[PDB]
């Protein structure tokens, strides 16, 4: 975020400002985060209450995403939410009962389950079948 | 699972009486510097 009012920095909407900041604007595209959150949140498993989303911002900010949230699908109001989140450190529901989006203290491990399996998405790594992988993993643990 | 919409402002501003009070502080400080 940056004051012009505070706006989420974008690759296309803002080009001169990030150049002044000296950051490579190629890595300045929050829509990829937007699209993922949409599919992760809209996936049936999230509806089944078996999914929680964590976000490690490139600056090092770790964000809590409550499964109950419903992010906007329009990219503009998506950004308007996170400028609010980044500055206010949290987001409250319309009914004012639970904080859907909350920033949390690093590292991620303390927030992760006691018994959990950790993996990354690597193009170079061996190709696997997700369904077989999850089956062979234990039950009490988490992925 | 329950679904609740997020609450947020379209444009974030980090009533008028407080705005009045803020200007008093600015005017007071500027007057203080001039007097010194």
């Amino acid at each position: 975020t940056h004051k012009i009012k505070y706006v989420l920095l974008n690759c296309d909407d803002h080009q001169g400002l990030l150049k002044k900041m000296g950051r490579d604007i190629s890595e300045a595209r929050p829509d990829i985060t937007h699209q993922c959150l949409l599919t992760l949140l809209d996936s049936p498993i999230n509806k089944a209450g078996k999914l929680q989303v964590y976000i490690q911002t490139s600056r090092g900010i770790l964000i809590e995403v409550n499964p109950t949230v419903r992010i906007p699908r329009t990219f503009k109001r998506f950004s308007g939410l996170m400028v609010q989140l980044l500055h206010k450190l949290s987001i409250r529901s319309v009914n004012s009962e639970e904080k859907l989006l909350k920033v949390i203290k690093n590292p991620i491990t303390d927030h992760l389950p006691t018994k959990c399996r950790k993996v990354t998405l690597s193009f170079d790594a061996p190709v696997i079948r997700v369904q077989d992988y999850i089956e062979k993993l234990d039950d009490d643990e988490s992925i | 699972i329950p679904t609740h919409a997020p609450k947020y402002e379209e444009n974030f501003n980090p009533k008028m009486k407080a705005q009045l009070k803020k200007e008093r502080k600015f005017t007071m400080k500027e007057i203080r510097k001039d007097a010194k």
Binding site: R70, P72, R73, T74, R77 | T3, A5, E10
Partner: peptide, 11 residues
């Protein structure tokens, strides 16, 4: 109740 592709309210 929001469902499917219904968007959060616009004000």
């Amino acid at each position: 109740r929001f469902k499917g592709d219904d968007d959060i309210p616009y004000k």
